[PDB]
């Protein structure tokens, strides 16, 4: 088990002086004393772990180690997040005789994750902490910097945590099996907290095994909170913010997920981003996809996701950062300023909005024995509108808007490209669809909520120009939402127009008509099958149907590109045939050539320039084709599945022995039945009276269950989506009854004109959005360079 930039860190660190502070222990005889009336145990760690440390001395009973390094502390929490601070639950960092002030709380969320992912995450965090320690000419960082950093691991589900990750945590010395207790004082234990200052560092993380060693390891404060029952990531975040954060009172809370490995200096970059400008309240870093042992042709999906991530980080994040409002901060890797998230005195704030979703989106069955029964009952009893009851879709995204548009605060959201983190993307198609469901739903709901409540930014204390530019960004987001809502209809219209154009006898392509008909039939079949499977079955079961649909859509996209190229070439040849010389004006006057070629080429050129200026050009070659071929799948399959499954009904449906006869030694059976005449007569009369009366009306008027409400909401949403898309399609191609209002000959010309107008509109809208994003990223680069010079 035990065996270049990192080397620089080791040189600056002495490694000889790591004596811990003395703290009061809890007596353990096996009666044990608990601090403040709570179940607290300070057990000793395995002797071998102590022996590994260089400072260990065989003569010393404990090796001469400090109290913190020698004993691991276990606490059982029964109250829950809401009352954790109210109760006298004291964490070790604040329990020292000299209080320790936290500067950076690194939160890690785990759920049945393999030991490899946790090992990679912990290796990244340890490397970042080592770099922070090694820093010499820093006012805040340097010697004894590890005392200001706390690593919190919140595992979701005691019975769902992977055994190998638990073994890894035990190897760190944080976790011990025997300590955990199910109940205390007839009260259920909601969470189990283990606190330990580990001096064990992960040397390397291979593909199959994890190797940890004690050589050149900086001490790290570890707090491992194991939850008794899984209550989702929102409940995990409630534990992190509402309960632990208040006790620790840290700044710049960093959120991480298992499998995300930050760089060697990324956390320092995030902290510097927060430190330079005091108005910044949230930050995010570039996220990258690993391509170590994945081939270009064997894994098209991975490379498509890589291209998507690179384009996002290069165009979308910089522009939003320039405007000061980021739609989404990646939960996998982001950071928030703690004070900015605090609610107002009135009780309304970003955290309240974020947490309300967990309470509202759940079965209305509250256990009276829970100590949080009053809070949940009050929250559910309150009248909730459409937006409040549907906050669960937005998730973290709501926090960004709530932070920017505060009543009287001046906060901003910023994106830094210096911070980089590597994560693992889902290789399988079913996992990809399941992941994209929530992304799409959250993005749509967040956009709608922000656009509807855009007036809230007026009261915020921002500069007038800042408000004007925020309004410009809101207008851009409105345009993007409108374009995204009509994605499927626009794709179908473009496909139909391009395929039918090949059917014209003017151009010499014979199989055009038959191919167009076959592709239309296959498209309709794929759409219908996708809808049926989305409503009925689970992605993991019927994966092959989705694979076939994706392959068909890739082939169709290839055919569409070929048709567009053929049409453009034919138009150019006709231009030359017409004679009278050729001029650039004539080329730009031809609708076919212009729309089909110029717009797409301009968009590609903008993407290429943006990639080059960021010194990340490879993704424009290695992973472009896969993304282009998969785009129709992105629009159709993912969007259909996301909209059909808006409601996430995780909870199930709903939720005195008469007697016991025991055979005795003899054949007789011991029974207790009525014997007296009086009681039998009384029972008979009671039955007669019970039946001898008319049936009263029920008039239950029960509130009923919430699952019906969310199912209704999802049904209405999908119906409206279908109706609008079909209205647009009927208007463009005269598909419905509109063809009756025209004649045999006028229909063709009118349809052609409408199709041309639609094509030019959509293509130029896409090109203009690309230009907008390009200019935004250019400005981001210029301003970042100028700030760096300063």
Ligand X SMILES: CCCCCCCCCCCCCCCCCC(=O)OC[C@H](COP(=O)(O)OCCN)OC(=O)CCCCCCCCCCCCCCCCC
Ligand Y SMILES: C[C@@H]([C@H](N)C(=O)N[C@H](C(=O)O)[C@H]1O[C@@H](n2ccc(=O)[nH]c2=O)[C@H](O)[C@@H]1O)[C@H](O)c1ccc(O)cn1
What part of residues 322-381 is at the interface with ligand X (CB under 6 A)? 322-324
Residue 330 binds ligand Y, judged by CB under 6 A: yes
Count of residues near ligand X by CB under 6 A: 63
| Distance between CA atoms of residues 190 and 181, nearest Å | 11
| Distance between CA atoms of residues 576 and 584, nearest Å | 12
Name which of 128 and 725 has its Cβ closer to ligand X: 725
| Distance between CA atoms of residues 419 and 695, nearest Å | 72
Side-chain-side CA neighbours of 645 within 13 Å: the count stands at 27
128: part of which helix (H) or strand (E)? helix 115-134
Side-chain-side CA neighbours of 50 within 13 Å: the count stands at 21
User: What is the DSSP annotation of 294-322?
Assistant: --TTT-HHHHHHHHHHHHIIIIIHHHHHH
From 389, 600, 622, 717, residue interacting with ligand X (rule: CB under 6 A): 600
| Distance between CA atoms of residues 103 and 271, nearest Å | 9
- SS3 of 93, please? helix
| Distance between CA atoms of residues 547 and 430, nearest Å | 9
Nearest distance, CB of residue 465 and ligand X, angstroms? 3
Count of residues near its own copies by CB under 8 A: 113
From 529, 590, 760, 765, residue interacting with its own copies (rule: CB under 8 A): 529
Residue 770 binds ligand X, judged by CB under 6 A: no
Q: In what order do the strands lie in the sheet with 253-257?
A: 40-44, 71-77, 191-198, 220-227, 149-155, 104-110, 253-257, 333-336, 280-289, 412-423, 261-262
Nearest distance, CB of residue 539 and its own copies, angstroms? 12
Q: Which of residues 625-654 bind its own copies (CB under 8 A)?
A: 652-653
Question: What are the two backbone dihedrals, phi and then psi, of residue 97, each rounded to the nearest 5 degrees?
Answer: -55, -40
Nearest distance, CB of residue 550 and ligand X, angstroms? 10
Nearest distance, CB of residue 516 and ligand X, angstroms? 9
Nearest distance, CB of residue 548 and ligand X, angstroms? 5
Spatial CB neighbours of 643, under 8 Å, sequence gap ≥ 6: 440, 714, 717, 718, 721
Q: Is 146 exposed, middle or buried (0-12, 13-18, 19+ CB in 10 A)?
A: middle
Quote the tokens at residue 590: 């031809």
Report whether 470 contacts 323 (CB < 8 A).
yes
Among ligand Y, ligand X, its own copies, none, partner that 561 touches (CB below 5 to 8 angstroms by kind)? ligand X
Residue 6 binds its own copies, judged by CB under 8 A: no
From 70, 533, 567, 629, residue interacting with its own copies (rule: CB under 8 A): 533
> Residue with structure tokens 């109706």?
723
Name which of 645 and 725 has its Cβ closer to ligand X: 725
Residue 128 binds ligand Y, judged by CB under 6 A: no
**Residue among 396, 256, 411 at smallest CA distance from 327:** 396
**Residue among 459, 463, 159, 411 at smallest CA distance from 279:** 411
Considering only the stretches 36-44, 328-336, 535-543, 701-709, report the one whose residues sit in contact with ligand Y under the rule CB under 6 A. Answer: 328-336
Q: Which of residues 696-715 bind its own copies (CB under 8 A)?
A: 708, 711-712, 714-715
Residue 191 binds ligand Y, judged by CB under 6 A: no
Residue 327 binds ligand Y, judged by CB under 6 A: no
Q: Which of residues 717-746 bind ligand X (CB under 6 A)?
A: 719-720, 722-723, 725-726, 729, 733-736, 739
Residue 163 binds its own copies, judged by CB under 8 A: yes
From 225, 240, 287, 301, residue interacting with ligand Y (rule: CB under 6 A): 287
Binding mask 293-312 for ligand X (x = CB under 6 A): ---------------x----
From 4, 16, 88, 185, residue interacting with its own copies (rule: CB under 8 A): 185
Among ligand X, ligand Y, its own copies, none, partner that 661 touches (CB below 5 to 8 angstroms by kind)? its own copies
| Distance between CA atoms of residues 133 and 143, nearest Å | 6
Name which of 579 and 694 has its Cβ closer to its own copies: 694
Exposure b/e, 150-163, CB count within 10 A at least 16 = b: bbbbbbbbbeebbe
Q: Which of residues 442-501 bind its own copies (CB under 8 A)?
A: 500
Side-chain-side CA neighbours of 338 within 13 Å: the count stands at 21
Nearest-CB residue for ligand Y: 111
Nearest-5° Cα angle at 720, 716 to 726: 145
Among its own copies, ligand X, ligand Y, none, partner that 533 touches (CB below 5 to 8 angstroms by kind)? its own copies
* Residue 342 to residues 320, 354, 359, Cα–Cα distance (Å): 24, 12, 19
Residue 186 DSSP symbol: T
| Cα 364 off chain centre by | 25
Nearest distance, CB of residue 110 and its own copies, angstroms? 15
Query: In the chain, how long is the greatest CA-to-CA distance?
Result: 120
Residue 446 binds ligand X, judged by CB under 6 A: no
| Distance between CA atoms of residues 786 and 781, nearest Å | 9
Q: Computed from CA positions of residues 484, 485, 486, 489, in that sequence, does the dihedral angle turn out positive or negative?
A: positive
Residue 762 binds ligand X, judged by CB under 6 A: yes
From 84, 111, 175, 196, residue interacting with ligand Y (rule: CB under 6 A): 111
Quote the tokens at residue 377: 């009952």
Among ligand Y, ligand X, its own copies, none, partner that 494 touches (CB below 5 to 8 angstroms by kind)? ligand X
Nearest distance, CB of residue 316 and ligand Y, angstroms? 11
Nearest distance, CB of residue 687 and ligand Y, angstroms? 21
Name which of 367 and 678 has its Cβ closer to its own copies: 678
Residue 565 binds ligand X, judged by CB under 6 A: yes
Provide the terminal-to-terminal Cα distance of the chain, rounded to the nearest Å.
Answer: 48
Considering only the stretches 171-179, 373-381, 453-461, 538-546, report the one whose residues sit in contact with ligand X under the rule CB under 6 A. Answer: 538-546
Q: Is 577 exposed, middle or buried (0-12, 13-18, 19+ CB in 10 A)?
A: exposed
Residue 68 binds ligand Y, judged by CB under 6 A: no
Name which of 166 and 501 has its Cβ closer to ligand Y: 166
Among ligand X, ligand Y, its own copies, none, partner that 110 touches (CB below 5 to 8 angstroms by kind)? ligand Y
| Distance between CA atoms of residues 252 and 267, nearest Å | 10
Name which of 64 and 157 has its Cβ closer to ligand Y: 157
Among ligand X, ligand Y, its own copies, none, partner that 111 touches (CB below 5 to 8 angstroms by kind)? ligand Y
* Residue 727 to residues 714, 737, 762, Cα–Cα distance (Å): 20, 11, 17
Among its own copies, ligand X, ligand Y, none, partner that 177 touches (CB below 5 to 8 angstroms by kind)? its own copies
Q: How many residues does the chain have?
A: 790
Nearest-CB residue for ligand X: 465
| Distance between CA atoms of residues 168 and 120, nearest Å | 12
Residue 233 binds ligand Y, judged by CB under 6 A: yes
Report whether 481 contacts 765 (CB < 8 A).
no
Residue 331 binds ligand Y, judged by CB under 6 A: yes
Q: Which of residues 502-521 bind its own copies (CB under 8 A)?
A: 503, 513, 516-517, 520-521
| Distance between CA atoms of residues 191 and 235, nearest Å | 12
Among ligand Y, its own copies, ligand X, none, partner that 23 touches (CB below 5 to 8 angstroms by kind)? none
Considering only the stretches 44-52, 255-263, 558-566, 620-628, report the one whose residues sit in contact with ligand Y under the rule CB under 6 A. Answer: 255-263
Residue 113 binds ligand Y, judged by CB under 6 A: yes
Considering only the stretches 132-140, 396-404, 654-662, 769-777, report the one whose residues sit in contact with ligand X under the rule CB under 6 A. Answer: 769-777
- SS3 of 783, please? helix
Q: Which residues bind ligand Y (CB under 6 A)?
A: 109-111, 113, 156, 230, 232-233, 236, 257-260, 287, 330-332, 423
Q: Which residues bind ligand X (CB under 6 A)?
A: 308, 322-324, 463, 465-466, 469, 483, 487-492, 494, 496, 524-529, 531, 541, 544-545, 548-549, 560-561, 564-565, 596-597, 600, 604, 628, 631, 634-635, 708-709, 712, 716, 719-720, 722-723, 725-726, 729, 733-736, 739, 762, 766, 772, 775-776, 779
């Amino acid at each position: 088990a035990f065996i270049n930039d990192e080397q620089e860190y080791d040189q600056r660190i002495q490694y000889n002086q790591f004596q811990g502070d003395h703290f009061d222990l809890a007596a353990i005889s096996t009666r044990a004393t608990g601090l403040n009336g709570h179940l607290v145990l300070d057990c000793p760690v395995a002797d071998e772990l102590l022996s590994k440390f260089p400072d260990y001395n065989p003569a010393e009973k404990s090796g001469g180690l400090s109290r913190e390094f020698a004993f691991m502390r276990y606490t059982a929490v029964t109250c829950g997040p809401s009352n954790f601070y109210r109760d006298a639950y004291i964490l070790r960092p604040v329990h020292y005789p000299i209080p320790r002030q936290t500067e950076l709380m690194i939160v890690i969320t785990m759920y049945n994750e393999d030991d490899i992912l946790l090992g990679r995450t912990l290796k990244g965090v340890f490397k970042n902490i080592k770099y922070l320690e090694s820093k010499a000419r820093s006012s805040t960082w340097g010697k004894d910097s590890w005392k200001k950093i706390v690593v919190c691991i919140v595992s979701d589900g005691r019975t769902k945590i992977n055994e190998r990750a638990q073994a890894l945590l035990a190897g760190l010395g944080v976790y011990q099996e025997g300590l955990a207790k199910s109940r205390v004082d007839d009260k259920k234990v909601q969470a189990h907290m283990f606190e330990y200052t580990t001096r064990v560092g992960i040397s390397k993380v291979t593909d199959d095994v994890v190797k940890l060693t004690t050589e050149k390891v900086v001490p790290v404060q570890m707090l491992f909170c194991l939850k008794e029952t899984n209550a989702k990531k929102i409940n995990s975040h409630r534990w992190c913010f509402q309960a632990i954060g208040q006790v620790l009172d840290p700044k710049i809370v960093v959120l991480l997920d298992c499998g995300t490995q930050p760089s060697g200096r990324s956390l320092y970059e995030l902290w510097k981003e927060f430190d330079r400008d005091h108005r910044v309240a949230g930050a995010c870093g570039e996220i990258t996809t690993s391509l170590k042992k994945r081939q270009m042709i064997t894994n098209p999906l991975v490379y498509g996701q890589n291209f998507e991530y690179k384009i996002s980080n290069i165009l979308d994040k910089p522009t939003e950062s320039s405007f000061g409002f980021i739609s989404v901060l990646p939960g996998a890797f982001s950071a928030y300023r703690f004070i900015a998230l605090q609610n107002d005195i009135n009780g309304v704030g970003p955290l309240e909005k974020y947490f309300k979703g967990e309470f509202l989106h759940s079965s209305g069955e509250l256990d009276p024995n829970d100590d949080e029964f009053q809070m949940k009952h009050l929250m559910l009893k309150e009248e909730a509108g459409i937006f409040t009851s549907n906050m669960y879709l937005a998730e973290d995204r709501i926090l960004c808007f709530e932070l920017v548009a505060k009543r009287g605060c001046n906060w901003l959201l910023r994106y830094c490209k210096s911070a980089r983190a590597e994560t693992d993307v889902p290789e399988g198609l079913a996992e990809f669809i399941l992941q994209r469901r929530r992304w799409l739903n959250g993005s749509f709901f967040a956009a709608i909520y922000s656009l509807v409540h855009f007036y809230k930014v007026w009261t915020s204390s921002h500069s007038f120009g800042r408000k004007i530019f925020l309004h410009i960004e809101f207008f851009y987001q409105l345009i993007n939402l409108i374009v995204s809502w009509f994605s499927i209809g626009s794709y179908f219209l473009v496909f139909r127009i391009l395929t039918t154009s090949l059917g014209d006898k003017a151009l010499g392509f014979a199989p055009g008509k038959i191919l167009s008909v076959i592709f239309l039939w296959l498209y309709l079949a794929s759409i219908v099958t996708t809808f049926v499977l989305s409503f009925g079955n689970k992605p993991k079961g019927t994966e092959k149907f989705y694979v076939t649909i994706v392959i068909f859509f890739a082939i169709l996209m290839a055919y569409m590109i070929f048709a567009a190229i053929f049409m453009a070439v034919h138009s150019i040849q006709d231009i030359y045939r017409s004679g009278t010389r050729i001029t650039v004006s004539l080329f730009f006057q031809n609708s076919e050539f212009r729309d089909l070629v110029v717009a797409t080429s301009s968009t590609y050129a903008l993407y290429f320039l943006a990639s080059f200026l960021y010194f990340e050009p490879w993704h424009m070659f290695t992973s472009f084709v896969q993304y282009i071929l998969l785009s129709p799948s992105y629009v159709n399959v993912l969007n259909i599945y996301a909209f059909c499954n808006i409601d996430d009904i995780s909870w199930g449906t709903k939720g005195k022995s008469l007697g016991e006869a025991k055979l005795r030694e003899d054949g007789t059976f011991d029974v207790s039945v009525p014997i007296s005449k009086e009681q039998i007569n009384q029972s008979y009369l009671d039955q007669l009276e019970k039946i001898r009366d008319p049936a009263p009306p029920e008039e239950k008027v029960l509130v009923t269950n919430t699952e019906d409400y969310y199912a209704f909401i999802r049904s209405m949403t999908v119906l409206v989506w279908m109706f609008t898309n079909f209205v647009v399609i009927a208007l463009v191609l005269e598909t419905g009854g509109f063809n009756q209002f025209v004649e045999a000959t006028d229909l063709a010309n009118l349809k052609s004109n409408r199709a041309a107008v639609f094509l030019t509109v959509i293509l130029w809208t896409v090109a203009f959005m690309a230009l907008f994003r390009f200019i935004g990223c250019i400005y981001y680069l210029i301003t970042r360079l100028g700030r760096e010079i300063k």
